[PDB]
């Protein structure tokens, strides 16, 4: 480690600040954001509340209702302090995903349908690894409830177990290889997605899980941080969706290149930065995914090979590739083009359109970790 990150301190770098921004001019954005994801403002909410008890997150692309968007939500809702709205979804989530049949009973299926219908009985990793997060700060910030499922802290323990010891008793799949401690792209394959690495996440998971796991969990952390080297591309630092456990794009579908799903490698650098402090290879990573995009401009963006190629097709979410690369200034915060990013960040307004749900996800988690917001919540 270079620095030492807020995990160990408990402040919380605010970037925009450090950067010239104002602090009433920041305080106001951050609430502006959430009022335009979570309140009414129809041409920019991604979140819909039903009933006096649930709520949901939608995809406003495909129509329906994510894991990832639902375990963002809680992550967001935890972060702003309102269990009205974590106890929403958690509960939208427990009702209408959690699986008690098939191979992947203990986990949530990936997709629904608004009305709460399956779309499937497959889940996705990154998902249960958010979900389980937003849980345990659940549980640090308001305590436990009495009544299930809001026992958050057990909810997260029991859903941890189930993805590292799932098929020991059984038909069922871990969610991570027990050998290599890699997060898998789903429990049934052997590859893995480099935006699901989340070394941080799994450094609190190494002392809230379950003690037969910490050790794992540790191990874990280290093998993500380990892995995301291989991965990035060495001269541009774009990761691909989809890798083998060896590092290489797994582009047997399609998805071996930079896009969509590759964002978040550069805000989960940064967010580890910030929470467990920077490193060399961090501050480097940031640089070369930075560097690459300083001569492109947002209209014309890309799908890229990692290696820079460009194809014809533009960025489906240039929003939320703004918003990653400039919470990746979190782990180069002395970087060649690190305030040009926040700043471009800062000159981009949150996302209208049916694409909106996946960009504005990014954003808000952005300007929450360059604000000093993105907290980790102790027992
Ligand atoms: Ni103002």
């Not at 269990?83 to 989530?93: A, E, G, L, P, Y």
């Not at 549980?139 to 802290?153: A, C, K, L, M, T």
Request: glycine share 8%.
């Amino acid at each position: 480690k270079t620095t030492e990150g807020a995990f160990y301190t408990r402040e919380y770098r605010n970037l925009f600040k450090e950067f010239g921004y104002s602090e009433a001019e920041i305080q106001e954005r951050v609430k502006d954001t959430w009022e335009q994801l979570f309140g009414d403002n129809p041409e920019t909410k991604i979140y819909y509340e039903v009933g006096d008890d649930l709520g949901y997150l939608l995809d406003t692309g495909n129509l329906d209702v994510r894991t990832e968007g639902m375990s963002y939500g809680m992550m967001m809702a935890v972060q702003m302090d309102r269990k009205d709205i974590f106890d929403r979804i958690w509960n939208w989530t427990m009702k209408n995903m959690y699986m008690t049949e098939g191979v992947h009973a203990g986990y949530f299926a990936w997709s629904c349908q608004p009305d709460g219908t399956k779309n499937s009985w497959g889940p996705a990793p990154d998902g249960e690894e958010y979900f389980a997060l937003a849980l345990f700060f659940a549980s640090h910030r308001w305590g436990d409830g009495d009544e299930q499922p809001f026992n958050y802290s057990e909810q997260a323990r029991k859903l941890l177990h189930t993805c590292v010891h799932n098929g020991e008793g059984g038909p069922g799949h871990p969610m991570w290889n027990r050998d290599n401690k890699l997060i898998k792209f789903i429990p049934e394959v052997e590859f893995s997605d480099p935006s699901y690495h989340l070394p941080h996440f799994y450094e609190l998971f190494s002392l809230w899980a379950n003690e037969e796991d910490r050790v794992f969990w540790k191990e874990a952390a280290e093998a993500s941080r380990e892995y995301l080297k291989i991965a990035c591309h060495p001269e541009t630092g774009l990761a691909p969706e989809y890798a083998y456990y060896d590092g290489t794009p797994n582009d047997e579908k399609g998805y071996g290149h930079f896009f969509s799903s590759s964002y978040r490698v550069a805000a989960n650098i940064g967010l580890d930065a910030e929470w467990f402090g920077g490193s060399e290879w961090s501050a480097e990573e940031i640089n070369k995914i930075q560097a690459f995009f300083a001569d492109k401009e947002p209209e014309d963006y890309r799908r890229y090979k990692i290696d820079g190629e460009p194809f014809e097709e533009k960025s489906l979410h240039p929003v939320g590739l703004i918003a990653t690369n400039a919470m990746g200034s979190l782990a180069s915060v002395d970087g060649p083009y690190a305030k040009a990013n926040v700043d471009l960040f800062w000159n981009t307004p949150v996302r209208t359109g049916n694409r909106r749900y996946y960009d504005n996800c990014l954003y808000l988690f952005a300007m929450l970790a360059l604000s000093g917001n993105f907290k980790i919540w102790f027992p």
